[PDB]
Amino acid sequence: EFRIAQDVVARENDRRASALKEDYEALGANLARRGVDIEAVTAKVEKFFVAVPSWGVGTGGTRFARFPGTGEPRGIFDKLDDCAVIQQLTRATPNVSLNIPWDKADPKELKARGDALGLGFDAMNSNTFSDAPGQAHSYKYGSLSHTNAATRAQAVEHNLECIEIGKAIGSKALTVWIGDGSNFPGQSNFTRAFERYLSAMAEIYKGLPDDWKLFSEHKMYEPAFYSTVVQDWGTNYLIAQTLGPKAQCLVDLGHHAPNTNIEMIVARLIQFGKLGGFHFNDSKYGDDDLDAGAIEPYRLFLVFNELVDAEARGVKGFHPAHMIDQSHNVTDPIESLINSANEIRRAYAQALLVDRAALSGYQEDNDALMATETLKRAYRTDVEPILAEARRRTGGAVDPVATYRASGYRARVAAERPA
Amino acid sequence: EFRIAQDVVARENDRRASALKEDYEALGANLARRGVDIEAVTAKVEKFFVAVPSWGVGTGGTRFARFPGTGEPRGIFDKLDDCAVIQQLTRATPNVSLNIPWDKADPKELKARGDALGLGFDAMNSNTFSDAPGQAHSYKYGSLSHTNAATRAQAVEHNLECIEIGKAIGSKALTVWIGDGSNFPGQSNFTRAFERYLSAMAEIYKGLPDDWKLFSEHKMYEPAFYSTVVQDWGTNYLIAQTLGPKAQCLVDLGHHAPNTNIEMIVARLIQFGKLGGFHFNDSKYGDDDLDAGAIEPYRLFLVFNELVDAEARGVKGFHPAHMIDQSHNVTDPIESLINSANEIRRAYAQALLVDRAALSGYQEDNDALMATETLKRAYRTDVEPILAEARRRTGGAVDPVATYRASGYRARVAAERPASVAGGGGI
Amino acid sequence: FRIAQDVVARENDRRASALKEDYEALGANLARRGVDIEAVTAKVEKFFVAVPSWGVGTGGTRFARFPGTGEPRGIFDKLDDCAVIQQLTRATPNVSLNIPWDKADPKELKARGDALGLGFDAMNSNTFSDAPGQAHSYKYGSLSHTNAATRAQAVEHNLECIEIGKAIGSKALTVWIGDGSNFPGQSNFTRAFERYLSAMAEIYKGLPDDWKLFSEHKMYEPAFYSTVVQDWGTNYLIAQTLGPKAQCLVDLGHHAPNTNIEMIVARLIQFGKLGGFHFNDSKYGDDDLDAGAIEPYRLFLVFNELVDAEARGVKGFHPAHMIDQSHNVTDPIESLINSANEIRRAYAQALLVDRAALSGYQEDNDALMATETLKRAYRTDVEPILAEARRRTGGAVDPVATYRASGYRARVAAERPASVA
Amino acid sequence: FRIAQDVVARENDRRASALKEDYEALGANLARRGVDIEAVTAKVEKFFVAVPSWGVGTGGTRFARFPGTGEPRGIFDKLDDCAVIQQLTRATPNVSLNIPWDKADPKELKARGDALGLGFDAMNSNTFSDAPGQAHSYKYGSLSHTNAATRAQAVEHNLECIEIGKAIGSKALTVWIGDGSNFPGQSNFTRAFERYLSAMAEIYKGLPDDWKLFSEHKMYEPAFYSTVVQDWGTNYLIAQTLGPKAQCLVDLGHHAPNTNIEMIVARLIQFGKLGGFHFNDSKYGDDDLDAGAIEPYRLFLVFNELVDAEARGVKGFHPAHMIDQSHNVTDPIESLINSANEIRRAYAQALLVDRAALSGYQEDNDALMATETLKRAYRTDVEPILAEARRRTGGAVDPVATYRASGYRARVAAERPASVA
Ligand SMILES: C[C@@H]1O[C@@H](O)[C@H](O)[C@H](O)[C@H]1O
Ligand SMILES: C[C@@H]1O[C@@H](O)[C@H](O)[C@H](O)[C@H]1O
Ligand SMILES: C[C@@H]1O[C@@H](O)[C@H](O)[C@H](O)[C@H]1O
Ligand SMILES: C[C@@H]1O[C@@H](O)[C@H](O)[C@H](O)[C@H]1O
Ligand SMILES: C[C@@H]1O[C@H](O)[C@H](O)[C@H](O)[C@H]1O
Ligand SMILES: C[C@@H]1O[C@H](O)[C@H](O)[C@H](O)[C@H]1O
Ligand SMILES: C[C@H](O)[C@H](O)[C@@H](O)[C@@H](O)C=O
Ligand SMILES: C[C@H](O)[C@H](O)[C@@H](O)[C@@H](O)C=O
Ligand SMILES: C[C@H](O)[C@H](O)[C@@H](O)[C@@H](O)C=O
Ligand SMILES: [Mn+2]
Ligand SMILES: [Mn+2]
Ligand SMILES: [Mn+2]
Ligand SMILES: [Mn+2]
Ligand SMILES: [Mn+2]
Ligand SMILES: [Mn+2]
Ligand SMILES: [Mn+2]
Ligand SMILES: [Mn+2]
Ligand SMILES: [Mn+2]
Ligand SMILES: [Mn+2]
């Protein structure tokens, strides 16, 4: 089924077909002069997919307030319906990331709806950073690293429950992010809390299917404001290495200290085989969870430069999980997810344009200026024509947001859903 | 009224009286050898007050979750009852800061309850960073700087209402903090938004009594994650200077960029007569709103060093409004506010111990090492006995938190108030 | 001519075909957006940024300096090198001097500049280091030093810089000092600032009627605890206190982590105190890296505020533009060339912004389309416009490639003796 | 004796009575808390931290260096000054050397050290600067340089540092390099690290059975975009890859803004890779300021982890302790004296923490009492313990005061020629 009428997509695409042809052919000629086949790039871009977060489909908020828009999804089923729109128009988000218990519902029904909408499911996300009604033990002072054994056991059981749900819908991985930490010096014994965490994660690893992966996600701060158990990639590496081959690290772009060189962290984790995946978003101050590439587009490109280089260096068995983790506080969530997915493909496309042979030469000769310019020649290239053509060829929209607005989808769901 | 039984306070004080006498006399002898009269210091500490936030007596949370404890205060009246405990035990928080509409209630009743509990009211706090039921215009895209004229007018009216309520309860100032800003480049035109803000603030300024102050509070980010209209002290100064004599700047410790020298900002504002007051708290990463001095006690001392220098260099017309602005997510709000107020008095007392003449000499001679050591000699002094004695002589508790726990107050209000339930934070 | 004309011609001809194809393609795309590429190119060829004399030689850190070959020996060699940057990019007609580093007969400096086709931008005083025969040391400060005679000495130095500038064609004085403290208590913040203000007031008195005085703020370094002119707030107080001729200079790498620099730029413009810019890039501190090499979007956002100012009709707005960088691991001439190019790049993209559309989205609070309006301009590869602007003004289509083809570095390496002690 | 014994005796006697009163008062206070002050003093007396040879001379920034009088030049002058710090504080018996800065005949270094009552701590190699007559430059790196011969030269240099150390009593080699990049693309992160790891393996092979190899991470400077050994995560990978004799060195000012450094310390201890510390304080970047002069509580929290490690009976925990600072506006000897004192101050306060009480509050999630348990120790003025520890071991009750009374600075100023009067 199509959430957006096919006649609307066809109409809006035809309206922009002429200009796209001119832009695509122009870029094709430019790339040909540079020894690059535009068709080879478009072919790869069409195959790049990033999972959308169910928790980002509705309007997000802060501790100060939440300003919902119209037609807010009422639950996971409305969220899947909205996710279907993002995938139909961009063709870059076939899978959805779920969070339990936020999206708890009959697994069988979830799968049925997904299949009908043309959507799959990515990594499951457990939730032991908030309390649910009727919960025996509170996570106020922690979960997997809580001082109380019964509380840790409850958190472990919750994670195993997440795996059972995932197995029923087609998921093949579990992502574990917890708020565990301290707000005051002395509140926690750093080593003992980490020892407790490692023991708990070992239990989860024991219950992990042999065709699944277990991802741990580090974060410098928030909700903990003095110390956090899984605070950075160093601790994250120790966790993954300790647990086993099926355990890897997940890197969320906005979870690092000010000025951190994130692309180097990505490179390091790849070298030691522990880069499990990404949580894309952008930021300026803290874990802002803004639209990917809206603040620092070059940084996003540099991260993708490391991913493409890995393939170029001949790294084997490298298939990181790509996911968007954002909060949309002042825009239509669907529109932001659409453009964010587009920006991620944009950075990927540019990274594919880098002349690896030239770059390697400049690195070996220590020609820093030409090396940086080699990256810039790729990054400065406006790859929008490739992104639009990729969408057009695969059933998507040349201009996703414009088509979304022309369809009147938001007004439609606003009438179907309570205010 | 006495939220805490007098017999409990007397009991816990007597139990620690012996140790206090020993420590106070020892410190007195040490200070005497240093040419300082401990009595003179204690006398000033007993008179240092800081306002408590009504929204701080309840458990706080983040966008991810909120984990309420037992006996959570229901409304402003319950909150005032809890604030009364902090003041009775520390004797450092006689005034309370209100936020409207959160604490909206009959001005007559509010004043009546305060007088009964022995509490006064500090600066009023307007709220246009969240929407209230029945609100005609949403503040989603701003308030005082919103592009829609009707929305700015609605925000101006709300602030004027806050002034009216304050006038009725004895308040003498209005603090304006808004979330106004953008999350994306291009979303807002920085200059146009600021022009709108200034014009709206001018309307609010017109409704200020002749003896009132209007405080604008800067904040680098949150809830806006790309730009904020009142983002730093520079913009804040421009605001105060533009509005008039009654407009001043409020400095909240956790609202600055990483590594900012905050004490210098305080000095600069004092020099140009625009330091309206402070919002005390501590932090390590962002606007963490943690207990004052729990993370960086020396920084708190350095801020007070600038304040005492002004309080010593005879800075005429200098009475900054001191207030605690914190969020208590993992502790009993009352206990944290108690120790936070204590830490603020600790930094103040230590600043009073600085040999100003010696410091001036080392500064003039460019003797950096002795100048810094002159500050350290005061800062390293354990002034707890002075704080404890000040509390004891004024009706407080030698050990506030110990006494609070011995009284069983939390268990009491827990039985009187409905049970709470954990939930989300707004994400 | 520092670079043989035949070389510039040969290299331009080699790349003529490709430039034609790219420029014409871009022109058609811009036309579809309602933008005249010729109007943009005409403005770009007139955008100038001053090159720092102190950035023509290899720079270093407190740990070490690794000089390359043919390092300039003095201001005359430096001007000769600046002439190369201007001949090839045509974006750097003026040079920024530092006294006493570049002290020499004003008449001879002017003669060399005229002969090379170069002018002089704002003078830069130096009271952050001690020169020979100095009566008082600047170890503990200069314009804000506790010792009156030391402040007087610093004032005289700045007045001397003005005299030198008047003789060579300069019209402004930039004052950046290291004054500050490394320990709490070392300085009385307020008194140190008052001392600074009194000294600057004296310097202001020596300003010709058509001169400007720029003060430059910096969060830290060389002072590691407090700095007298630490941020734009203090900087504004300075400018406002001194008078109409006094304005603030914004050096991109001088702000706290995560600071919204483009907002500071807008605030200063609103209150008429944006004197100028010191362009460079950074990631950690005052790194002084090549402009746009680390965060190109931020540079574009700064230029977006500068172009918006014109769009709003701000009157008498002519900020001074200067590059202030340190080239530690590259040929200084090549880095200055590409940095000047990046600045024109950001400027050109800022000119492409559809401000009619942007104003609409801002009024309607359409944050997504507003940000996308800025991105449509920023994502545009304007290299063809920069290259054509150079071709038509006597410059090189590919400046660095032409510089390398000329063999200039090897030439000066043979002419200049390297320092031995 | 660098400082006359009569002067030390006189200045101690002058302050003896006051110390007695303060020590007895603190003794009574600690007694009421169940702690024996004599036990704490005994431990403090045994805590030592190495002094940097490169720290007794006045330091500077890339902008300037303002030397004081009697500047030590050469390792012999430096050892003479380091001897003053040890004599007065009794907390710095060993000196950290840097090669080639301190190159000299080992036989003479040892002879001078023995005569002054000084030993030698970890050796520090230097491949972040070029020495005259060097075959290959380190401009673009050293142990991770793309050129094989350059990496070999750097490895040989480090092996030479081990040879010198073996002859003078050292038992470790600390390796800090500037290797990194200033521009994206300049270096391939992974390849550069592979080159570094291979070179370090060669150095590891030359380590005696009882030696340790310390690698030191640093976020930035001299490299301003990326650094090979940028943080503790990379450092851990290095130590674990090299072998049991390789550990990580933590320099306090080498971390990103707001980093929780004490946790990094705890993590390294848990996995047996905490090799040692480089103490100093900072506010902005790698400021290299006097330890505890900016954030004393943070220093205490670091020592809280060190004391807790022993409380838990950790194995393989014998960290080296060294001061790594730059003294730009103070008498280097006085700053090192007070910095060593501040380190012992934090240690003493960490020893006062009631571990039993703390553990109880941690298990019960009583965050407020847990933090107040740390504060009760930290708020305690342990100066009497530090002064008594010095008095009992031949040191000065008030080190800096005694140093000033001795007239030592004026003495060496008269023996050492400055560049200018
Ligand atoms: C973006 C990244 O690029 C390369 O590393 C591989 O193709 C990998 O599968 C992909 O995820
Ligand atoms: C802003 C924040 O809001 C809630 O979480 C609480 O009222 C808390 O005390 C306050 O600090
Ligand atoms: C006494 C006082 O000292 C400083 O604060 C300033 O110089 C101020 O102007 C003066 O009034
Ligand atoms: C790196 C720096 O170099 C010099 O300035 C001095 O040796 C100083 O002590 C050191 O910290
Ligand atoms: C001089 C050098 O400086 C580095 O930044 C690091 O701190 C090293 O430990 C030190 O030896
Ligand atoms: C007494 C004199 O003191 C100097 O400081 C130096 O150590 C000389 O070597 C010694 O002869
Ligand atoms: C909802 C999801 O678990 C969450 O966003 C985490 O992944 C992490 O980003 C939190 O800061
Ligand atoms: C509730 C109160 O208005 C609030 O705390 C503001 O003062 C400011 O700190 C917000 O970040
Ligand atoms: C050389 C010039 O005065 C200097 O670079 C200043 O402008 C400032 O950037 C210093 O950090
Ligand atoms: Mn995430
Ligand atoms: Mn950045
Ligand atoms: Mn997150
Ligand atoms: Mn506040
Ligand atoms: Mn700090
Ligand atoms: Mn706040
Ligand atoms: Mn500058
Ligand atoms: Mn600079
Ligand atoms: Mn070090
Ligand atoms: Mn260092």
Closest CB to A129 among B64, B139, B187: B64
Distance from the D343 Cα atom to the nearest Cα atom in chain A, whole angstroms: 19
Measured by CA distance, the residue closest to atom 6 of ligand 3 is: C191
Spatial distance between the Cα atoms of D177 and C418, rounded to a whole number of angstroms: 26
Q: Which ligand 1 atom lies nearest to the CA of residue A320?
A: 11
Spatial distance between the Cα atoms of D344 and D338, rounded to a whole number of angstroms: 10
Closest CB to B26 among D25, D290, D368: D25
| Phi, psi (deg, nearest 5) at residue B174 | -125, 125
Question: Which residues of chain A does C331 touch, with a Cβ-Cβ cutoff of 8 Å?
Answer: 369
Token digits for C25?
A: 């393609």
Q: Which residue of A has its CA nearest to B293?
A: A184
Closest CB to D283 among B23, B259, B335: B259
Token digits for D219?
A: 């976020």
Q: What is the CATH number of the domain that holds D203?
A: 3.20.20.150
Token digits for C37?
A: 């590429």
CA of C261, nearest ligand number: 11
Distance from the B335 Cα atom to the nearest Cα atom in chain C, whole angstroms: 32
Spatial distance between the Cα atoms of B64 and A127, rounded to a whole number of angstroms: 10
* A390 close to A43: Cβ distance less than 8 angstroms: no
Tokens 């410190």 -> residue = B27
Token digits for A135?
A: 């919960």
Q: Which ligand 8 atom lies nearest to the CA of residue B125?
A: 3
Amino acid at the residue D200: M
Closest CB to B422 among A138, A225, A285: A138
Question: Which residues of chain D does C285 touch, with a Cβ-Cβ cutoff of 8 Å?
Answer: 220-221, 284-285
* D350 close to D299: Cβ distance less than 8 angstroms: no
Spatial distance between the Cα atoms of B124 and B176, rounded to a whole number of angstroms: 9
Could you tell me which of C82, C141, C138, C137 has the C-alpha nearest to residue C113? C82
Question: Which residues of chain A does C400 touch, with a Cβ-Cβ cutoff of 8 Å?
Answer: 369-370, 373
Domain count, chain A: 1
DSSP B100-125: TTTT---HHHHHHHHHHHT-EEEEEE
Sorted by sequence, the CB contacts under 8 Å of residue D243 that are 6+ apart come out as D204
Interface B–D counts its CB contacts (< 8 A) at 71
Amino acid at the residue C74: G
Helix axes A190-206, D261-270, angle to 10 degrees: 60
Strands A181-182 and A227-228: antiparallel
**Buried (b) or exposed (e) across C256-265, using 16+ Cβ within 10 A?**
bbbbbbbbbb
Spatial distance between the Cα atoms of B179 and B156, rounded to a whole number of angstroms: 15
Ligand 14 geometric centre to CA of D257 (Å): 8
DSSP B51: B
Q: Is the peptide bond before B223 cis (omega within 30 degrees of 0)?
A: yes
Could you tell me which of A382, A399, A13 has the C-alpha nearest to residue C30? A382
How far from the centroid of its chain's Cα atoms is residue B4's Cα? 24
Spatial distance between the Cα atoms of C248 and C237, rounded to a whole number of angstroms: 10
**Annotation-wise, does D6 bind a ligand?**
no
DSSP C96: E
Q: Which residue of C has its CA nearest to B364?
A: C146
Spatial distance between the Cα atoms of A82 and A54, rounded to a whole number of angstroms: 9
| Phi, psi (deg, nearest 5) at residue B222 | 75, 115
Ligand 16 geometric centre to CA of D88 (Å): 43
Q: Do B384 and D379 touch (CB under 8 A)?
A: yes
Chain C residues with CB within 8 Å of chain D CB: 59-64, 66, 128-130, 132, 137-140, 178, 182-184, 186, 219-222, 224-225, 257, 282-285, 287, 289-290, 293-294, 328-329
* C46 close to C393: Cβ distance less than 8 angstroms: no
Token digits for B263?
A: 């004490």
Amino acid at the residue A124: M
DSSP C318-336: --EEEE----SSS-HHHHH
Token digits for A231?
A: 């605070």
Task: Give, for B279, the enclosing helix (H) or strand (E).
Answer: strand B275-280
Alpha helices in D353-382 (DSSP H): 355-363, 367-378
Q: Do C189 and B264 touch (CB under 8 A)?
A: yes
Spatial distance between the Cα atoms of B249 and B238, rounded to a whole number of angstroms: 10
Distance from the C58 Cα atom to the nearest Cα atom in chain D, whole angstroms: 12
DSSP reduced 3-state for C119: strand
Spatial distance between the Cα atoms of A127 and A100, rounded to a whole number of angstroms: 6
DSSP reduced 3-state for B323: strand
Resolution (A): 1.7
**Buried (b) or exposed (e) across A379-409, using 16+ Cβ within 10 A?**
bbbbbbbbbbbbbbeeebbbbbbebbbbbeb
DSSP B4: S
Spatial distance between the Cα atoms of B214 and B203, rounded to a whole number of angstroms: 12
Spatial distance between the Cα atoms of A63 and C221, rounded to a whole number of angstroms: 37
Ligand 4 geometric centre to CA of D54 (Å): 6
Interface A–B counts its CB contacts (< 8 A) at 126
* C254 close to D145: Cβ distance less than 8 angstroms: no
Token digits for B267?
A: 């000095």
- Determine whether the shortest distance from the Cβ of C194 to ligand 3 is under 6 A: yes
Could you tell me which of D196, D204, D195, D271 has the C-alpha nearest to residue D240? D271
Token digits for B111?
A: 């004043």
C-alpha to C-alpha distances, A24 to A340, A347, B238, C19, C373, nearest whole angstrom = 22, 18, 50, 18, 21
Q: How many CA atoms lie within 13 A of D312 on its CB side?
A: 18
Spatial distance between the Cα atoms of B70 and B76, rounded to a whole number of angstroms: 17
Full 3-state SS string of chain A: CCCCCHHHHHHHHHHHHHHHHHHHHHHHHHHHHCCCCHHHHHHHHCCCCCEEEHHHCCCCECCCCECCCCCCCCCHHHHHHHHHHHHHHHCCCCEEEEECCCCCCCHHHHHHHHHHHCCEEEEEECCCCCCCCCCCCCCCCCCCCCCCHHHHHHHHHHHHHHHHHHHHHCCCEEEECCCCEECCCCCCCHHHHHHHHHHHHHHHHHCCCCCCEEEEECCCCCCCCCEECCCCHHHHHHHHHHHCCCEEEEEECCCCCCCCCHHHHHHHHHHCCCEEEEEECECCCCCCCECCCCCCHHHHHHHHHHHHHHHHHCCCCCCCEEEECCCCCCCCHHHHHHHHHHHHHHHHHHHHHCCHHHHHHHHHCCCHHHHHHHHHHHHCCCCHHHHHHHHHHCCCCCCHHHHHHHHCHHHHHHHHCCC
Spatial distance between the Cα atoms of A84 and A79, rounded to a whole number of angstroms: 9
**A136 CB burial (10 A radius; 0-12, 13-18, 19+):** exposed
> Integer distance in angstroms from the first to the last C-alpha of chain B?
41
CA of C259, nearest ligand number: 11
Could you tell me which of B292, B248, B283, B289 has the C-alpha nearest to residue B266? B248
Helix, strand, coil tally for chain D in percent (to 5): 50, 10, 40
Q: Do A258 and D259 touch (CB under 8 A)?
A: no
Spatial distance between the Cα atoms of D333 and A323, rounded to a whole number of angstroms: 56
**B245 CB burial (10 A radius; 0-12, 13-18, 19+):** exposed
Strands A120-125 and A173-176: parallel
Spatial distance between the Cα atoms of C280 and C336, rounded to a whole number of angstroms: 10
* D325 close to D280: Cβ distance less than 8 angstroms: yes
Q: Which ligand 2 atom lies nearest to the CA of residue B66?
A: 5
Q: Which residue of D has its CA nearest to C139?
A: D66
Spatial distance between the Cα atoms of C371 and A293, rounded to a whole number of angstroms: 11
Spatial distance between the Cα atoms of C299 and C279, rounded to a whole number of angstroms: 9
Spatial distance between the Cα atoms of A145 and C11, rounded to a whole number of angstroms: 66
Spatial distance between the Cα atoms of A237 and A231, rounded to a whole number of angstroms: 11
C-alpha to C-alpha distances, D125 to D99, D161, D176, D214, nearest whole angstrom = 5, 6, 7, 11
Spatial distance between the Cα atoms of A31 and D421, rounded to a whole number of angstroms: 67
Number of helices and strands in chain C (H, E): 15, 11
Token digits for D78?
A: 């430096």
* D148 close to A266: Cβ distance less than 8 angstroms: no
Chain C: partners with 3+ C-beta pairs within 8 Å: A, B, D
Spatial distance between the Cα atoms of B232 and C48, rounded to a whole number of angstroms: 32
Dihedral angle sign, alpha carbons of residues D319, D320, D321, D322: negative
* A257 close to A215: Cβ distance less than 8 angstroms: no
- Determine whether the shortest distance from the Cβ of B99 to ligand 8 is under 6 A: yes
Token digits for D301?
A: 């929290």
Measured by CA distance, the residue closest to atom 6 of ligand 5 is: D176
Could you tell me which of A189, A50, B318 has the C-alpha nearest to residue D309? A189
Q: Which residue of C has its CA nearest to A347?
A: C379
Strands (E), D239-341: 246-251, 274-279, 320-323
Spatial distance between the Cα atoms of A394 and A387, rounded to a whole number of angstroms: 11
User: Which of C63, C137, C177, C182 best tests the D interface by mutation, with the highest count of D CBs <10 A?
Assistant: C182
**Annotation-wise, does A373 bind a ligand?**
no
Token digits for C112?
A: 């060399």
Distance from the A293 Cα atom to the nearest Cα atom in chain C, whole angstroms: 10
Measured at the alpha carbon of residue A282, what is the angle toward residues C217 and B262, in degrees to the nearest 5?
Answer: 35
Token digits for A24?
A: 């695509």
Sorted by sequence, the CB contacts under 8 Å of residue C319 that are 6+ apart come out as C274, C275, C276, C277, C306
Instruction: Report the DSSP beta bridge partners of residue D321.
Output: D277
Provide the 10 A C-beta neighbour count for residue B241.
17
Provide the 10 A C-beta neighbour count for residue B425.
19
* B180 close to B187: Cβ distance less than 8 angstroms: no
Spatial distance between the Cα atoms of A48 and A343, rounded to a whole number of angstroms: 12
Sorted by sequence, the CB contacts under 8 Å of residue A149 that are 6+ apart come out as none
Ligand 18 geometric centre to CA of B57 (Å): 45
Strands C320-323 and C274-279: parallel
Could you tell me which of B223, B427, B177, B200 has the C-alpha nearest to residue B323? B177
Instruction: Report the DSSP beta bridge partners of residue C65.
Output: C60
Dihedral angle sign, alpha carbons of residues B381, B384, B390, B393: negative
Spatial distance between the Cα atoms of C211 and C222, rounded to a whole number of angstroms: 29
Amino acid at the residue B282: D
Provide the 10 A C-beta neighbour count for residue B71.
22
Question: Which residues of chain D does C62 touch, with a Cβ-Cβ cutoff of 8 Å?
Answer: 59-62
Spatial distance between the Cα atoms of C381 and C90, rounded to a whole number of angstroms: 20
- Determine whether the shortest distance from the Cβ of B356 to ligand 3 is under 6 A: no
Q: How many CA atoms lie within 13 A of D106 on its CB side?
A: 13
| Phi, psi (deg, nearest 5) at residue C148 | -55, -45
Token digits for B3?
A: 């939220």
Q: How many CA atoms lie within 13 A of D365 on its CB side?
A: 19
Could you tell me which of B223, B258, B224, B218 has the C-alpha nearest to residue B238? B218
Q: Do A359 and D232 touch (CB under 8 A)?
A: no
Strands B213-217 and B247-252: parallel
Task: Give, for B248, the enclosing helix (H) or strand (E).
Answer: strand B247-252
Ligand 10 geometric centre to CA of A218 (Å): 9
Q: Which residue of B has its CA nearest to D296?
A: B298
Alpha helices in B170-279 (DSSP H): 190-205, 233-243, 262-271
* A252 close to A219: Cβ distance less than 8 angstroms: yes
Closest CB to A285 among C18, C258, C372: C258
* B29 close to D18: Cβ distance less than 8 angstroms: no
Token digits for A406?
A: 């022309």
Spatial distance between the Cα atoms of A40 and A349, rounded to a whole number of angstroms: 11
Q: Do B373 and D18 touch (CB under 8 A)?
A: no
Amino acid at the residue C179: D
DSSP B325-337: ----SSS-HHHHH
Q: Which residue of B has its CA nearest to C353?
A: B186
Instruction: Report the DSSP beta bridge partners of residue C110.
Output: none
**Annotation-wise, does D286 bind a ligand?**
yes
Q: Which ligand 7 atom lies nearest to the CA of residue A327?
A: 5
D420 is in which domain, residue-wise? 1-421
Spatial distance between the Cα atoms of A120 and C8, rounded to a whole number of angstroms: 58
**Annotation-wise, does B282 bind a ligand?**
no
